[PDB]
Each structure stands twice: as structure tokens, then as C-alpha cells.
Assembly symmetry: D2
Homo-oligomer: 370 residues x 4
């Protein structure tokens, strides 16, 4: 009578699914392809929606400890402050990726989720069979494809899809705060520092805690200096001289990567006993900082629909119908914002922009009205 | 088998108790002495702790709609900004008293709490008897004394106590925002505007929403002009000229009162089947903006302890033991702050100051670390 | 024994020459080609050097009354303040062109300078003969060619020269201050408001007094909207929205012109009894705001050299040798600044930039050290 | 035929008189009581009027080199900026006392003024006799009493007078700028930093040049800590913490003095061939920073009246009649400002306040209109 779930992928989506299912009495095993449990991307923003998932997962405490809510989300254009936004009290948080990942892994382990590394799902069958690269075939009542933009759970089954990999991208790093060295200013703020002149270069400045600063350095791929790794210190200091202390530390990082944006959209997220969650289903532009938020809401919501006494197949259909439109709208709006460079104007966290963030997955209503 | 509760007082404490008990299946009747259900005091701050009570009461949505979280809590001394505090993301909110009261009344009514007006508790018996001014004697399994600083539930039984009524006080009003007329500034902020020179006059500036502004005008009773009602417009405009548009509206209010501060502390909060909650038990100085927050946490916590399968008498003892120290510490610290004028320095919402605010009554842990 | 001077041109150079010579006992007649005595160009800056000429001319009082020294000379790039300069106390002043012109005309009249309008010099002879368009031939001991960039005194004689008329230019206007309507800011400042993005548009904001504001609206000739007269209100408000009240008034002016920059440089400024002064000799780019300053210093200096007991011919040679290098350097540096857009960086009023301004023609030394 | 002048006192008044007379062909001897030529008081402000005297004395160049005009004269009350004043371009300057004194001494020496030290005037006779402490009796056509508030030239003759020495005063010091250590701010400004709460303490912050800062630390004599010398570092840092780097240097100065304010007013300034100039005649409160300015204007004006071909006795009478009302008005207004603490309000350099500053002694008119 113990339902069995097999989860492919140990990112935020897979860990969320695994914890949520285990809390509801599922026998859960999670399979991570990589040799270690790790999260790439340097830093990450969560909002009310994702923080509520964490509360629902019993992992909120560990996350809030050692992460940061800036006093304001500030936008600059050509070094002129154009907006300061606080979202009418809507909760939000910045943290390192490792911080969020560790909290989730620790919670999954505390609950007794069986986690395997070097364990890649290479095929999934809608009847409830997952095949690993080792040739092991696992039977389950539920298969969760949380295996990222390149999901083999998805592609082994075949889902009609549009995927896009941009030519442009950015360099994401964690460096020391160097707060004193930054001198006068509001250095606890998020500051999105846009420029189009004299060149297209932007830094998203994102404090994670008293020690760690998350920087995103964005320049076009066609710019050989701005897109260089390790960073071309001179061209960054030239346009962001007020960040020189931090940029000097950034230039030391030989692990720096220029990572490209990538999106996925599918005609459906389910097939029989298989559900696709996270980037496997709905990778999106990061303008609204909701890729993981939506992934986590969707994973948590999946566990909710599986508590209705329905067949797994029916629960999965109900789940997508219920929760997908929030994600579709957020993905579309984030892509629109990215293409139009809407964030450069400031004051763009409108009620519509904040729809996903306002959703409370625990009570299934929208909170924090704007 | 339906447990019966009789609640004396229709303030925030009594309404919270009534809703929380009704949600847990108690047959609840609430008795308000006044001819109408009303809340005095103009405006009010709630923090995470109180907002979590509201969530637990199913009244959070109605409260957040039409209330305000300032971008920052700012302090001025002699018109110089000395601090801006955002509490590392700790949720907080400002609203009119009527806004909070209405949300609670509407929720109690929706749940079918029996509410009587012109119904004053004049005596309570620890065996579970409440006598109204009408001579009606009501039997119950639980009596809640939520009847304010002058609690007759408390005083009919006899509780060792120290009460204090200050000679000093303040004038609290709601006026239009007049935001455009205030011109350049950060007029969505809370701004605590202190002065000792040329006279002791202070205004706590507290936006409630896009339409309503809560002002507290504080001057010593020995100052015949600053303590006058309706307000002596000239002496307020002289020291707060930047608020003239709002003060002109304030001066129109012939309902204005100079209300005195009042505190209560008791050796215990329980006797048999009687529990004292709110100002009946623990009225405190308003420096930490936690009088109602603690009252609401205590009322909600009472309902929790009554779900343990214990006798009512034992549950009440357990309740006070569990929850009272948070209130004792907050009351003491708020009184210390008031006497030392500590808030005038700015940056005084320390981790210790925020202890009560950080408490989450739903999960019974402290959240939002500083 | 009364030396006779004939001056061609009633601009700042010619009026300065006429007053200075008349003060020294010359019989002076001045000939203005136009039907009225008028000054075009809306507004003008003078510095210490030009203010000292005015003192020497007995016209300083009338100029300082009704003109303005801003508290600072401020530069913006893309709406971000990049510098505020006060030149270590070096005197400077902004005024309407008419204000300066009127003061000079009134002083010349008070001294009994004979002024003719509709009186154009069409030929000059180094032996001391000036021919007017009327055919009148005037004999004099000194002929002053103060007849502008298109000087016929110069060109009738033949001076080796390089002249340049730019394709680009600007629209100069006087509008009401609208100070209250501009709201919060430092609206008594000079503010040089540069932009390259989203288009090349710049406004030099120059208060003249409590009533009048001098604006220079600069856009490339290749921009059909930004270079349009009367002004294309929308494209100016878009990039300078904080000046909308003033720009609305500017758009009413059907007299607005897009005037082109023009320079002149000559191998010499003298021939026999003929001296060329002002734009006739040394028109320059306006970056250092010294075209008229140098013109006035040169005209005044001419009068000084004529007091040495030398022949007029020798005095003129001595004059150019003594005073020309200040002008040559200023012209070259202003042209360099214009071409490199150096002023866009702010903090460019260096000691070298301010050399002409620092010169005191009365004492013949440099003052106001930097 | 060479007129002989004997000047008592080598302060700013006596040096000005000596230079001005020597320039006009007087045989001038100056007698300084002290063993060295020195100026006490740390720093000093001059305005247009005094700068024009310096121009008239041929000492302006040496003064402007190595002195400072702040970008603005700023006033703070309780650390809040209440005004920024630039006087519509009216020239002004801050310098060390030694800087001004040296320039004057060097000019007097260059002109061949005979200067004696350890040479005290102890008696003067209206017939033109000056007696030194050595017993030497000097005959002259003019005797100038420029010997300070305690003038023996004045008191040996007997002038009806009111003198006042205040109980209160201030500590004036020169310290290093420590500009970098002061961090963010407008540290080239004059800043008059007033406080009445928590104690009456004020600092006038006055940069003299890139190296030297003039500070005036003002507290009541009844305050044993604030009036202490060497300075009580703690009580100054407490109320001016932003000046700590400079105050630490100030506390090292064991030469610091708490000097009292002193005023003098006389029924007349002349007797026969004797003229009283400077503090000997008109010491005043320093609120308008015009004590030396008026002293210098008066000394220079004296030389002017002596060029009219009148008897010395008549010239002196004409001089006082012509020039004294400017000083009487300035003295009265400065005393009014001091007593009413008017400067604490900011924006008090009104046209009337600036009357003395606006006077141009060279042309004998008022300039720099407000
Ligand atoms: C630049 C940038 C900035 C962003 N910023 C934010 C932000 O601020 N806030 C936010 O909420 N989101 C943000 N996002 C989006 C966020 O990174 C993703 O949406 C999120 O990490 C998706 O998580 P996931 O678990 O679906 O996928 P992934 O994080 O890709 O994790 C899947 C895990 O899949 C494992 N794996 C892959 N294939 C297999 C397999 N076949 N079998 C087993 N394991 C497999 C992968 O190795 C890995 O361990 C940002 C994205 C980008 C690109
Ligand atoms: C100036 C000031 C500012 C404050 N600001 C804040 C703030 O910002 N945030 C915050 O959390 N707290 C604040 N407080 C404290 C807050 O006002 C109180 O702690 C709170 O209202 C107490 O609620 P209560 O229900 O216990 O009592 P009450 O609000 O006094 O309500 C009891 C209700 O008792 C009814 N009643 C009385 N006697 C009887 C009886 N015998 N029988 C039946 N009914 C009876 C009373 O009429 C009334 O309807 C502030 C207090 C003051 C004085
Ligand atoms: C955009 C711009 C901004 C500027 N801003 C400043 C500034 O802020 N400060 C500054 O000092 N300078 C400034 N200048 C330069 C300043 O305008 C000139 O250098 C100055 O006006 C030259 O004066 P002028 O007397 O030599 O010539 P003009 O002003 O040209 O005057 C000559 C006079 O010549 C009369 N005339 C012409 N031909 C004859 C003839 N044949 N016979 C008789 N009369 C004749 C002309 O009609 C006229 O009345 C600026 C210039 C430009 C273009
Ligand atoms: C706190 C303070 C701040 C001030 N700030 C300013 C300011 O910013 N700007 C400004 O313009 N003014 C200022 N003043 C006023 C200024 O200090 C005086 O007005 C000025 O120094 C007066 O100069 P004096 O030459 O008349 O007298 P003094 O400076 O007193 O000089 C007279 C000289 O007299 C010599 N002496 C005295 N007796 C004899 C004698 N019997 N025989 C020979 N020699 C004699 C004295 O030793 C000395 O060398 C300030 C004054 C004070 C108190
Ligand atoms: O626009 C972005 O690339 C972006 C990336 N991360 C967070 C965010 O709010 C925006
Ligand atoms: O100090 C107060 O009186 C006070 C009153 N209300 C809220 C608060 O934070 C402080
Ligand atoms: O750069 C200019 O065009 C310019 C024009 N007028 C004054 C000035 O300082 C600069
Ligand atoms: O008020 C003063 O003591 C004062 C002292 N020096 C200059 C000044 O402007 C004011």
C-alpha cells in the first residue's frame, strides 16, 4: 500500500518533489546524474511563492538563516537611480544556490529520501518504469522528470516542444561583499545596473548575506571583452567603477562561465504515470526571477494533487490543468520583458509581473495584493 | 460534548480568541459591553507574529487588502534622518484600527460566533460562570477575560496586579494622505519624527493605504498647546512644517482625544476555567508596537493548548507557562524603551526588540532571523 | 590733436572698442549695418576676464544688476550628476544677450559715442579710410573691424584665413524660469544636460535672473526632429521630462532658429591703421564660453596699446603680439573640447581651460588661481 | 613736502593704513608693540569689500594664492542642512590669519614702510605727537591709532566709549583638512554646525586651502567641558562625530585658547591729526565676518580722504562722516545676529546683512546686488 515514486534529477524541482512526496508517505527515491549533489548558477532569488513552498517542505528555517532580504530592489540606468521597489511587503529573499540546495538536501535526508548520485535516468515509460544508465529498470507508481532542460525522461517518451538556446548570456559569480570598500551608498540593496552607452553592459548586484555577494555580469556574446571569462577586469571597472573592489575579486575566479539563456515549452507535462517538472517542462527567461519559484510551486502542487484519492494518471492531468497557467503566463511575460529590456525602465514589477510571486501554494490563493 | 466558551470583550484579543475557538469546534459566544462593535485608536501596526495569527484565523486576506507595508521604517531626530530599518524581510503592516477590527468581526460572523453588544461581563467565577450586567448567569467550560485594561472578569475574581496610568499621552488621528501636497520625499515610509528642541514634540507618521494616513502627535501633558484637542495647528505646523497639508486636515477633527498610556502586569493570567488575555493581563507601552500582537498571539495560543486533551484548568496553566515569557520580555523592553526614549536614536529594532515579532505562533518557533 | 576712430560693427566687440577709446579721449564713431541695435543668441556667459572689461568700461554695475551667478556649474550625463564646479571663486555671470548689449549701448551713449545704424562698412584702407555702403568715405587715425565673422573690413583688405561653418548647431531661446513648476531640484544652477542614448540630445540650462531662463537645445542637423524649429516638443520632453514646464513655453516661440557653429582664424589681425577684433578675427567654438570674453578683452586691450605714445601702426602690432596668444590658445582648446565632447565628462574646467577667464585685462596679470 | 605718518599697531588695520599711505607718497613708519609681527585667531573670512581693499593695496594676488572660496556657505541645525548660500556671486574667501598677515607685511616691506617691533605707542597728542614706551617722541602730520581694542592712542587722548567683554567665547584652531578621512560629504564647504540639544555646542567649519582647516569651537563659558583647553575631545566628538579625524588633531594643540568676544563703540574716531581705525574704534561681534573687512575699508578710505588737498584735520572729519555709517550699521546688525542667534536659522545673509560686503571702496559704490 506504500506508493512508490522515482524522481529523476536532484535540482530544486526534484528535491522539492521528493520532500513533498515523502512527507505524504510516499516511498521516494531520487536519482542525480552528477557524481555529487551540487547547484550551479552562483546565486538565486526566491519570492513569497517559493518561500511558501519551503515552509510547506519544512525547509524554510534553514533557508532564511544565512540569506538576505534587501531593503529595496533598485534599478539604475546609466548610473542614475530610476526606481526603488518593495512590492508592498511581498516577501522575497536572495541566497547562494548552494545555500538553497543544501537546505533542500538536508531536509530530504532528514526525511529518509533515498538519494543516489551517478544515477542517470535515460528512459521512462508512461506505465511506470524508469531505466537508469546502469541498465537498472525501476518500477514505480509515479515517475517525476525533474531532469532539467535536457530531460531524458521527457525526450525518451517524446513531447512536442519548442526549445531555444540564446547566443547571449551572462557571467554569474559569488564574491565577498567588500561592503566597507564600497564606501558611501545603499550596498544592501538589490541594484540592477543597466547601460546601453557607451556599450551594452549590465550588472545585477545581489547581496546574499553579510559575507557573500552574487553578481551577474551581462554583455552580448558579440562583445569579445565583456563576454570573456575569466572576466576582463578593465571593461567592467570602466562602466562600474563603484564596484571595483568586488570586481577585482571577481577577476580572480578561473571557474567563471559565460552561460547562455535557454527556454522550453511543451504541449503537455504528463504521460500516464510520468510528470515533468521544472526546466524539463518550462525553462524560461530569468527577468521575473521565477524559474525555480515556478518549478518549486509545480513540484509541490504535484504532491497535493496526488492526495485526492484519484488514480495517479488522473491526478497528473488534474495537476497540470490546475497549476500550468500560472507558469505559462509567467514564462511568456518574462520572455517579453527580456526581449523588450523592460526591466531597464524600472518600476516594472507590476501586479501582473508579480502574479507568480503572489501565489500561495499552501492555501491555493493569491496573497500580498499590490 | 460540545465545549462552551464565553468571551468577554470584542477587541482584538476577544475576537481572536472567539475565532480560534470556533475553528476548533467550540460553541462560542462573545459579549461586548459597548452598544456597537468598534475599535478606537485610529491606526495600528502588526508584525509577522500578528500576521501569522491572522493567517491562522483565516482573516489574513481581508487584512492585507487595503493595508500598507512601508518601504522602510525611518526615524528622524530634529528633521535629520538617523535610521532606515527593514528588519531583514520580517513581515509587517500598517492599517486603520477599523480595518483590522472589521476583518476580525467579519470572520467571526462567517464562522457563526454568537456576538452580543450591550453585553457587559461584570463577574466571573473560576468554576465556569459568567454574570452579565443584565443579571444573566452563563455557564461555560471556558471563560475568556478579554475585557481590556479595566477587566471586570479579572477584578471580580481578584488578581494581584500593578497598574499604571501615565500623565502623558498622545493624539491619534486618521487623515487623508495628501501625498501630492507633501511634495518631494519618501512619503510611503513610516517616519518617526522626534524632537526635544525647541520643545518636546514628536509625530509618528504611518501610512495605512493609498487613502489614509495614521498620525500620532505626542507632546507632554504639561504642554498646554501641544496636548490640546482639537489640535493646536500652529504649534504642530511650526515643528513639522513639511506635514502642513495633513495637519490642516487633522485640525478639523473635533473627535480628537489626548489619550494616556496605561500598563497592567499580573502575577498570573488564569484561575480555574478563566483565562485573561490582552490588555486585561498585559497592557504595555507601545514603543515596540506589540500590544495587540502579543494579545493576538496569546489568544490564539490559548486555543492551541485547549486541543491537548487536558482539563481546561490544566490547559490554561500550561498555556501561561508556555507563552507568557515572550510577553513579559516584550512588555519590559517596551517600557524600558519608552522611559529611555530609546527609539529617538534610531536603529533600535534589534534582534531582542524584535523577539515578539519574530515568533511564529503557527509553528511555535522563531522565524525571520536578524 | 583729437585722434579719430571709426568702428565697424555694433556687437560686443565694437561697443567695447568704442567705449574704451572714447574714455581715452578719442573721437569715436560706430557704424552698425543693421537697422536697429540688437544682439542675437538669447543668452550669454561672462567670466572674470569679461567682467573686468566691463569694470574698465564703467558698465559693470548695469550688467550685474539683473543678471545671475549660479551657485554651481553642474554637468549631467544621462540624467546623472557627474560634476559640480565653482572655479575656486573665479567670478562668472549669466545674462540675456539684450541685457549685456543694452548696458554697453547705454554706456556708449552716455559717453557721447556717435552711433549710426543702417551704416555698413564695405571697404577699409590700411591708410585710414573707411567706405560705407552709402558711398561715404571716412578718414580716421584708426579703423576697427568689429564686423563679425563675415567682416568686410577684413575681406576688403584681404587676410589669409581659415573659416569653417559647421553642419551642426543648436536652438537658443529665452523662456520664463517656471521655477516653482520645476519642483524639487537645484534650479538656480547652470546644468549642462548631456545625452548620447537613446539619441544625441543635450540642453544647456542657464538661468539669467529670477525671471528669464536661457536654454540651448543641441541636436545634430541629421536629426530632423531634434533640429526642428519651432521646437519638436515631444522629442525634447521625452529626454528632458523634468524641464517640461519650460519646454512647453519654448515650443511657443516661432522665432526659434537652428544656428550653426562658425570659426575664423587669421594669420594676422592688423594692417596699417586697421585692427580686426572679435569674431572678425577669432570666432571660436563655444565650449569654454569665451568668444565674447576674448573679443571684449581684445577690444579693451587695443585701447590700452594706443596709449603708449607710439604710432597707431606700431601700437596695433604691439597689441596683437601681446594679447593674441591668450585667444589662440582658448580657441584651440575650445575647438578640441567641442570635437572630443570633453564637457560631457564634467570637471573639465581645468586651470588650462580657465586661462582666458583668469586673465585680468585691467592689471594685465592672471588672477583667481585654481 | 613729504607728509609723515606714524601708525600704531601692526594688525590688519595698521598694515592696511601703512600700505595705502605709502602708495600715496607718505613717509610711513609703523610701530608694533609685540616682539614679532604675528596674527592671532587661526583663520579669517574676507568678502568683496576686503578683497577690493587688497586689490587697492597691491596685495590681492598673494592672498588669493593659497586661500579658498568654498562652493557654498552651508548651515546645519542639529546635523540637518538648513541652508546653502552663495550670495549671487559676491566674492568671498577664507584663509589663515598668518596668510593674510604675511601678504600685508610683505607688501608693506616691498613699498619701504618702516616697521618697528617692540615699539608700543603709549600716548598720542592731537597736534601730531606720538610717544613710545621707550620715551621717544615722534612728530607727524598724521597719527593712526590702529592699536586694537585696548588702544592707548585712543585712551591717552580720551574718547567717550562703550566697551564690552563677553563671558562667552570660542576656541579657534588650524588643523589638517583630513579630507579623505572625512569620507562622503561636501567638505570644501563652509559649514556652520549649530546645536542647542543635547547641549549648546557649535562648530564653524572653514576650509582655508587644500592643506589647512580653520575650526571655531563654540560653547558657553559655563560649560566646563566644552570651553576647556586643550579641547575635551570626547564632548566634541559626541556632537560632531563626522569631524572626529579633524578633532583628534585639534586635541593635540596645547596652544588652544578660549577667547572672549569684545566690542567697542566710540562717539568719534578722530581728534586733530589722530585717526582711530579698526578694533580701536569699532570692534564688533563676528556674526557677519566683517570686523577686519570694515577695519581694512576704513583704513583704506582714510588714505583716500587725505588726497583731497584739505588739512589733515579736515580730511579726518570728512573721512569719518563718509565711511562710518557702513560700520555702525554692520556692527549693530552683527550684534543683533549674535544675540538672537540669527545665523542658526540659515538664509540670513540678506541684502542688509551683506551691505558692508557689497561696498566697493575703490569705486565708492555698492556692487554685487542681491
Ligand atoms: C541566469 C539565470 C538566472 C536565474 N535566476 C533565477 C532566480 O533568481 N530565481 C529563480 O527562481 N530561478 C532563476 N533561474 C531559473 C532556475 O535556475 C531554474 O529554473 C532551476 O534551477 C530549474 O531547476 P530544475 O530542478 O528544474 O533543473 P536543474 O537545476 O537543471 O536540475 C536538474 C538536476 O538535473 C540533473 N540531471 C539532468 N539529467 C538527468 C538525468 N537524465 N537523470 C538524473 N539527473 C539528471 C541535473 O544534473 C541536475 O542535478 C535562473 C536561470 C538562469 C539561467
Ligand atoms: C497609543 C497606543 C498605540 C498602540 N499601538 C499599537 C500598535 O501599533 N500595534 C499593536 O499591536 N498594539 C498597539 N497598541 C496596543 C493595543 O491598542 C492593545 O494592546 C489592544 O487594542 C488590546 O486589545 P484587547 O482586545 O486586549 O483590549 P481592548 O482593545 O481594550 O478591547 C476590549 C474590548 O473590551 C470591551 N469591554 C470592556 N469591558 C468589558 C466588559 N466588562 N464586558 C464586555 N466587554 C468589555 C471594550 O469595550 C472593548 O470593546 C497601542 C496602544 C496604545 C495605547
Ligand atoms: C552658440 C553660441 C554660444 C555662445 N556663447 C557664448 C558665451 O556664453 N559667452 C561668450 O563670451 N561668447 C559666446 N559665444 C560667442 C559670442 O557670441 C561671439 O564671440 C560674440 O558675439 C562676437 O561679438 P562681435 O562683436 O565680434 O561680433 P557680432 O556679435 O557678430 O557683431 C558684429 C555686429 O556686426 C554688425 N555688422 C556686420 N557686418 C557689418 C558691416 N560690414 N558694417 C557694419 N556693421 C556690420 C553685425 O550686424 C552686428 O551688429 C557664443 C557663440 C555661439 C555661436
Ligand atoms: C572670534 C573672532 C572671529 C573673527 N572673524 C573675522 C572674520 O572672519 N573676518 C573678519 O574680517 N574679521 C573677523 N574678526 C574680527 C577681526 O579679528 C578684527 O576686527 C581685526 O583683527 C581687527 O584688526 P586691527 O588691526 O584693528 O586690530 P588687532 O588685530 O588687534 O591688531 C592691533 C595690533 O595691535 C598691536 N598693538 C596693540 N597695542 C599697541 C600699542 N599700544 N602700540 C603698538 N602696537 C599695539 C597689537 O599687538 C597687534 O599687533 C573676528 C574676530 C573675532 C573675535
Ligand atoms: O533580467 C535578468 O536577466 C534577470 C536575471 N535575474 C533576476 C532578474 O530579476 C532579472
Ligand atoms: O514610541 C511610541 O510611542 C510608539 C507608538 N507606536 C508605535 C511605535 O513603534 C512606537
Ligand atoms: O559646449 C557648448 O556648446 C557650450 C556652449 N555654451 C557654453 C558652454 O560652456 C559650452
Ligand atoms: O557667529 C559667529 O560667531 C561667527 C564667527 N565667524 C564668522 C561668522 O560668519 C559667524
Amino acid at each position: 500500500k506504500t506508493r512508490r515514486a522515482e524522481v529523476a534529477g536532484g535540482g530544486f524541482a526534484g528535491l522539492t518533489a521528493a520532500i513533498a512526496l515523502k512527507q505524504n508517505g510516499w516511498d521516494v527515491r531520487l536519482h542525480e546524474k552528477s557524481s555529487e549533489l551540487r547547484a550551479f548558477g552562483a546565486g538565486i532569488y526566491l519570492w513569497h511563492n517559493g518561500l511558501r513552498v519551503l515552509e510547506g517542505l519544512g525547509a524554510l528555517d534553514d533557508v532564511l538563516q544565512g540569506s538576505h532580504t534587501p531593503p529595496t530592489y533598485e534599478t539604475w540606468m546609466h548610473n542614475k537611480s530610476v526606481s526603488k521597489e518593495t512590492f508592498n511587503g511581498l516577501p522575497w529573499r536572495i541566497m547562494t544556490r548552494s545555500h538553497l540546495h543544501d537546505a533542500l538536501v538536508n531536509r530530504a535526508r532528514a526525511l529518509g529520501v533515498d538519494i543516489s548520485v551517478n544515477s542517470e535516468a535515460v528512459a521512462a515509460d508512461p506505465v511506470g518504469r524508469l531505466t537508469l544508465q546502469t541498465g537498472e529498470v525501476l518500477e514505480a507508481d509515479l515517475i517525476v522528470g525533474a531532469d532539467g532542460v535536457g530531460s531524458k525522461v521527457r525526450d525518451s517518451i517524446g513531447f512536442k516542444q519548442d526549445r531555444w538556446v540564446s547566443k547571449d548570456g551572462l557571467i554569474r559569480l559569488i564574491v565577498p561583499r567588500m561592503k566597507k570598500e564600497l564606501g558611501h551608498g545603499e550596498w544592501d540593496n538589490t541594484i540592477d545596473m543597466w547601460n546601453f552607452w557607451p556599450r551594452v553592459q549590465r550588472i545585477l548586484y545581489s547581496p546574499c548575506n553579510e559575507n557573500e555577494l552574487y553578481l551577474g555580469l551581462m554583455a552580448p556574446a558579440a562583445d569579445p571583452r565583456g563576454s570573456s571569462v575569466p572576466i576582463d577586469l578593465e571593461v567592467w571597472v570602466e562602466m562600474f567603477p563603484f564596484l571595483e573592489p568586488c570586481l577585482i575579486e571577481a577577476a580572480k575566479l578561473k571557474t567563471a562561465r559565460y552561460d547562455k539563456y535557454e527556454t522550453t515549452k511543451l504541449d503537455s507535462w504528463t504521460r500516464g504515470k510520468v510528470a515533468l517538472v521544472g526546466d524539463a517542462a518550462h525553462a524560461m527567461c530569468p527577468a521575473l526571477a521565477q524559474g525555480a519559484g515556478c518549478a518549486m510551486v509545480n513540484a509541490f502542487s504535484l504532491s497535493q494533487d496526488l492526495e485526492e484519492g484519484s488514480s495517479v494518471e488522473d491526478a497528473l492531468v488534474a495537476w497540470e490543468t490546475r497549476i500550468r497557467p500560472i507558469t505559462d503566463r509567467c514564462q511568456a511575460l518574462s520572455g517579453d520583458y527580456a526581449a523588450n529590456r523592460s526591466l531597464s525602465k524600472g518600476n516594472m514589477f507590476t501586479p501582473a509581473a508579480l502574479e507568480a510571486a503572489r501565489y500561495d501554494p499552501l492555501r491555493r490563493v493569491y496573497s500580498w495584493p499590490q
